[PDB]
Design a protein around this nucleic acid. Structure first.
Length: 904
RNA sequence: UAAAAAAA
C-alpha cells in the first residue's frame, strides 16, 4: 500500500523539575516574530532595532570562477577595494563565498561587469539569481511544523543576512581579518594577543550566527581563537605598541625572531636575552634547510614599502648575496637612499622576471594564517580557557561595536544578553561497592559546589572486579633513539609493585610478579616495499606465546607517539585481541596513587568489571516496567577523513544490563568521504541484540534509545528518515531470527546530541531557593551549576530540544550539550528525557566525574577514535599492497574482544 | 598514551 512516515518529532511539553534560576546567554534578540500578537510581549521588552535586515529586498547573483577560496575571496575584495565607485558599496556587497554574491543594490548599475553576464574582472561570471526578501526571516516564528522550521533554519534569507552583516563588520577603518567566511578578528591596540610558536601570535576574534527561537529571532555571538603570522614589532596590549603600532618591523626582524624562538624551544636554556645574535652564516642555512621557517616563507605575502595595496608573495631564497648580485646595495643605496644592514644575507625572490629584493626591507602583509600543526598545545589551550565572566566581557567587547555598526542603516538597551530561565536538576546517586556519593545542596559560601558531579575513589571500592588474581605484565616500549637509563629497570619494578598494591585497595588483584620486558626499535613498517620492524618482530613473538590470564601494560618511553600508539593498538587489539593498557613512563614513574587509580578504572572495564554505577532507584527509570527489562541504550558517532580523502568511520555501542556500566560495540567504514548519515546502521544492531539477550536470559529489549552524535541540523531529517528507519527495519528482521520466530517491533526514541555549539551560559546569582526555602548554590567554578537545564527562550520553535550542562567546567566556560529528541515512540515527557540525559552523564566509567554528554555518546566517540587508529595503522601498507575493499582498510577486530570495551 | 575540563 503506502510507505510509513518518519517525521521529525514536534515538541510536546516543557520540563518542570529542578531548582529555578535565571542565567544569561550569549544571544541578542533582534526581533519578535511577525506572527506574535502585539498584546503578548510588553512594548518595552521588544527590541528597538529596525533596519534593512528587517525590511529589505536583496539582489543575488550566482557567480563562477576562472579555484582555492583564498584566490576567489581575495579576488572579490580586490574589485571592491580597487575601484572608487564600488568601494562606496563595499558594506552592501558580500560573497557567499563560492556560489553567490549578495548586494543591497543591483550589480548591473556598475560600469564594471559590462560583459560578465579591469583585467582580473575576467575571471568572474555574473548571473542575477533573483531577489531575497529579508523580512520573511521574521515570519513563521510560532509555526508548529518541524518541516517548515527546518527549511527556515537552513534558509537562503538567513545566510544572506548573516553574510551581509559580515560586509558591515568588514567595513571599518580598523584592521580586520576574515577567516573561513564567518570568523572576524580585529587587530587594534585593544586586541587580545600573545606570541605563539614560531613567528606567530594567537588572537581572539568573534563570530556570529543567527538562531531561530520561539517568536522569534536571536543573534548569537562567541569568541574564536586563531593563530596568525606576526607582522608587527610588538603585539596589541604591550605599551610599546600603543605608541608606535607602525614601528619598523621588516622581514629580517621576523626571521631573527623565528631563529631565537626556534632554538629556544628546540634547545633549552637557550635564552634569546643572552644568546649571541646570528652572524648571518647560521642564518642562511636556517632560512633554507630548516622547515620551522621554510614552510612559513613558502608563499608568505610581503610588501615593498620603498615604492610609493599590492602584496607580492614569495617563491623561495636565492643563492647570491646582497653584495654578490650584479649592484643591489648600490641600487638601494643610490636609487632609494637606503643602507643594507645585512648585505651578506641571501636575498629572496618574488617571482619573475627578475624581481628580487633583500629581506631587510620587505614588510609582511597582516592577517595571514599561521599554517602548520599546533605543537604548543598548552599555550593554544590556555589562551581560550577564560571563565564565563571574563569571556562574556570579551564577547561583548569584540562583538558589540561590529554588531551596532552592522544593524544601522548605511548613511543600546537593545544590545544586551538575553536572560533565560534555567532549572538545576539534582545529581543522581553514584553507587560504589558498599558506599554512595550524593551531592547535598549547600550555600555558595565554602567551595562545596565543586563536588557535585566530581568525586574520587577514596574510601571506595569498585562494584565488580575480576574473581581471580590476574597477571599484569610490563612491556617497556622504548620509542626513543637511545637506550633507557640503568636506573629504569629498578624504577619500574618499584612502580609495578606499588601499582599492584594501590589497586588492591579498589578491589583489583594483580599479580605483578612477572619480569618487565624491554622492546627497542618498535615502530610502524618502514620502506614500494615495507618490511616489519623490530621489535614489532619481537612483540609479535611475545604476543602469540602469551600466558593465559595476562594483562599487558605497555610502558611508553616517550608519550605522544601517534604512529607507535596506533600500531601497539592495531597489533594487540585488532590482530591479537589481547587485553592491554598504555601508560606513559614519565607519568607512571611518579607513582601517584591517583594516577594508578585512574588507570585500573580502564583495566577493570576491560576485564568486564564495573567501577561505579547509578543507584538502584536511578536505574529504575531506564528499565521498561512492562517487562522488567532494561532499555537498550545505543550511542553512535561518525568521524571523518581518517587519512587524506578517505571514507568516514561510523560506530555503534550499546548497553546490555540494567546497570549501564558496560557498552561494547562495533565500527564500520562508511561508503564515502565525509558521509555523516550512517546509511546501514541497522546492520550493527545485530550484535547489540545478541549480547543483550545473553545478559537477559535470551530476551530482546522492549524499548530502545538511540543517542546520535555529531549531526548538524540539516541532517536531522535524514537521521530520522534514514538511520532510525534502518534501525527499526533491521530489528524487525533480526528479531524473529533471534526470539524463536516472533514479531519484533520495539519502540525507539532517538536523541541527537550536539556537544560542540556556540551557546554559553553565565550565572547571575550565587544562590537560589530550592523548594524548601533554603538558599542554595547555583554555580560552581564560576560557571552555571551542573546540571543546569535550559529549555526555554533560546530553544527551537517546534523541535523537542533542550540544553543541559552536566559537568563541572574545570577550566574556562563550559559548553552545554544541545539535545534534540528527533523521534519518539514511547511518549517521553521533557522531565523524563532531561533526567536520564543528565543521569547518563554520571556513568562514564573511566573518570570520577559527570561528563559533558551521556556516556553512550562519549563511548561511541572513543570507539570511532580507536577505529581510526586501526585504519591509520595499516594504511600505508594498504595503499601499496593494493579503490580498496572495506575490510582491508578497516578490518574487524579479533572476536575475543568484540564484546569488550577495548576502546576505553 | 591516568583522568575529567577548556581550544580547534
Amino acid at each position: 500500500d503506502t510507505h510509513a512516515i518518519y517525521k521529525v518529532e514536534n515538541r510536546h511539553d516543557y520540563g518542570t523539575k529542578g531548582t529555578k534560576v535565571d542565567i544569561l546567554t550569549n544571544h541578542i534578540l533582534l526581533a519578535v516574530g511577525n506572527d506574535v500578537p502585539t498584546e503578548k510581549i510588553d512594548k518595552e521588552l521588544v527590541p528597538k532595532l529596525d533596519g534593512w535586515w528587517k525590511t529589505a529586498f536583496i539582489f543575488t547573483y550566482h557567480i563562477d570562477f576562472k579555484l582555492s577560496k583564498p584566490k576567489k575571496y581575495e579576488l572579490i575584495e580586490a574589485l571592491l577595494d580597487e575601484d572608487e565607485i564600488l568601494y562606496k558599496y563595499r558594506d552592501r556587497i558580500a560573497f557567499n563565498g563560492e556560489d553567490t554574491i549578495y548586494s543591497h543594490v543591483p550589480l548591473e548599475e556598475f560600469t564594471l561587469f559590462d560583459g560578465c553576464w579591469e583585467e582580473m574582472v575576467s575571471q568572474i561570471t555574473l548571473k542575477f539569481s533573483g531577489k531575497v526578501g529579508l523580512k520573511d526571516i521574521y515570519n513563521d516564528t510560532t509555526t508548529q511544523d518541524t518541516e517548515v522550521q527546518e527549511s527556515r533554519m537552513s534558509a537562503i534569507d538567513k545566510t544572506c543576512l548573516l553574510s551581509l552583516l559580515g560586509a558591515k563588520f568588514m567595513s571599518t577603518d580598523d584592521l580586520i581579518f576574515q577567516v573561513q567566511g564567518n570568523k572576524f578578528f580585529i587587530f587594534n591596540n585593544f586586541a587580545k594577543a600573545i606570541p605563539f610558536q614560531i613567528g606567530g601570535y594567537l588572537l581572539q576574534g568573534f563570530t556570529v550566527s543567527l538562531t531561530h527561537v520561539y517568536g522569534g529571532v536571536a543573534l548569537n555571538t562567541v569568541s574564536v581563537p586563531a593563530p596568525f603570522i606576526k607582522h608587527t614589532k610588538y603585539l596589541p596590549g604591550d605599551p610599546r605598541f600603543k605608541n608606535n603600532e607602525k614601528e619598523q618591523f621588516t622581514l629580517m626582524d621576523w626571521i631573527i625572531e623565528c631563529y631565537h624562538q626556534s632554538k629556544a624551544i628546540r634547545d633549552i636554556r637557550y635564552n634569546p636575552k643572552t644568546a649571541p645574535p646570528p652572524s648571518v652564516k647560521d642564518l642562511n642555512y636556517f632560512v633554507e634547510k630548516n622547515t620551522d621557517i621554510s614552510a612559513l616563507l613558502k608563499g608568505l605575502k610581503v610588501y615593498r614599502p620603498y615604492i610609493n595595496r599590492s602584496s607580492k608573495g614569495i617563491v623561495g631564497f636565492t643563492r647570491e648575496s646582497a653584495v654578490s648580485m650584479r649592484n643591489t646595495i648600490d641600487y638601494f643605496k643610490r636609487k632609494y637612499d637606503i643602507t643594507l644592514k645585512y648585505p651578506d644575507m641571501k636575498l629572496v625572490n618574488l617571482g619573475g622576471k627578475n624581481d628580487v629584493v633583500p629581506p631587510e626591507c620587505l614588510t609582511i602583509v597582516p592577517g595571514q594564517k599561521l599554517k602548520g600543526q599546533i605543537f604548543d598545545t598548552k599555550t593554544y589551550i590556555d589562551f581560550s580557557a577564560i571563565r564565563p565572566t571574563e569571556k562574556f566581557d570579551l564577547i561583548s567587547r569584540l562583538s558589540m561595536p561590529a554588531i551596532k555598526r552592522g544593524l544601522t542603516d548605511s548613511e543600546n538597551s537593545a544590545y544586551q544578553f538575553m536572560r533565560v530561565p534555567s532549572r538545576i536538576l539534582d545529581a543522581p546517586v553514584v553507587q560504589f561497592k558498599e558506599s554512595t556519593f550524593e551531592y547535598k545542596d549547600k550555600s555558595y559560601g565554602t567551595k562545596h559546589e565543586e563536588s557535585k558531579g566530581n568525586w574520587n575513589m577514596k574510601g571506595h571500592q569498585f562494584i565488580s572486579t575480576p574473581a581471580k588474581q590476574v597477571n599484569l605484565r610490563a612491556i617497556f616500549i622504548n620509542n626513543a633513539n637511545t637506550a633507557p637509563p640503568a636506573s629504569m629497570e629498578s624504577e619500574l619494578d618499584i612502580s609495578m609493585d606499588k601499582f599492584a598494591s594501590d589497586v588492591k585497595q579498589l578491589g583489583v588483584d594483580f599479580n605483578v610478579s612477572g619480569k618487565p620486558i624491554l622492546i627497542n626499535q618498535f615502530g610502524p613498517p618502514i620502506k614500494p616495499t615495507f618490511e616489519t620492524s623490530p621489535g614489532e618482530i619481537s612483540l609479535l613473538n611475545l604476543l602469540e606465546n602469551i600466558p593465559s590470564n595476562t594483562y599487558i601494560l605497555y610502558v611508553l618511553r616517550r608519550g605522544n607517539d601517534s604512529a607507535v600508539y596506533d600500531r601497539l593498538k592495531y597489533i594487540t587489539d585488532l590482530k591479537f585481541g589481547a587485553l592491554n593498557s598504555c601508560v606513559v613512563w614519565d607519568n607512571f614513574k611518579k607513582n601517584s596513587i591517583q594516577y594508578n587509580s585512574n588507570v585500573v578504572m580502564k583495566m577493570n572495564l576491560k576485564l568486564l568489571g564495573s567501577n561505579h554505577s547509578l543507584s538502584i532507584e536511578n536505574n529504575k527509570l531506564l528499565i521498561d516496567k512492562e517487562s522488567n527489562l532494561p532499555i537498550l541504550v545505543l550511542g553512535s558517532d561518525v568521524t571523518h577523513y581518517p587519512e587524506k580523502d578517505q571514507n568516514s568511520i561510523a560506530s555503534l555501542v550499546g548497553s546490555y544490563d540494567d546497570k549501564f556500566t558496560q557498552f561494547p560495540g562495533d565500527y564500520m567504514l562508511q561508503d564515502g568521504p565525509g558521509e555523516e548519515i550512517i546509511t546501514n546502521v541497522g546492520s550493527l544492531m545485530l550484535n547489540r541484540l545478541k549480547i543483550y539477550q545473553k545478559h537477559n536470559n535470551g530476551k530482546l529489549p522492549t524499548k530502545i534509545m538511540y543517542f546520535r552524535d555529531g549531526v548538524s541540523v540539516d541532517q536531522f531529517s535524514q537521521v530520522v528518515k534514514i538511520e532510525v528507519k534502518s534501525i527499526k527495519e533491521s530489528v524487525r528482521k533480526f528479531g524473529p531470527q533471534l526470539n524463536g520466530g516472533n514479531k519484533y517491533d520495539p519502540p525507539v526514541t532517538c536523541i541527537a546530541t550536539v556537544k560542540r555549539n556556540q551557546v554559553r551560559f553565565i550565572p547571575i546569582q550565587e544562590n537560589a531557593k530550592n523548594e524548601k526555602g533554603e538558599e542554595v548554590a547555583v554555580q560552581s567554578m564560576g560557571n552555571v551549576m551542573p546540571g543546569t537545564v535550559v529549555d526555554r527562550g533560546i530553544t527551537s520553535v517546534a523541535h523537542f530540544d533542550f540544553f543541559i550542562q552536566s559537568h563541572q567546567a574545570l577550566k574556562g566556560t563550559g559548553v552545554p550539550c544541545h539535545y534534540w529528541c528527533l523521534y519518539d515512540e514511547n511518549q517521553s515527557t521533557s522531565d523524563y528525557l532531561q533526567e536520564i540525559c543528565n543521569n547518563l552523564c554520571y556513568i562514564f566509567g573511566r573518570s570520577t566525574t559527570s561528563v559533558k554528554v551521556p556516556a553512550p555518546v562519549y563511548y561511541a566517540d572513543l570507539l570511532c577514535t580507536r577505529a581510526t587508529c586501526f585504519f591509520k595503522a595499516g594504511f600505508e601498507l594498504n595503499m601499496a599492497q593494493a579503490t580498496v575493499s572495506k575490510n582491508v582498510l578497516l578490518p574487524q577486530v579479533n572476536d575475543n574482544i568484540k564484546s569488550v570495551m577495548y576502546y576505553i
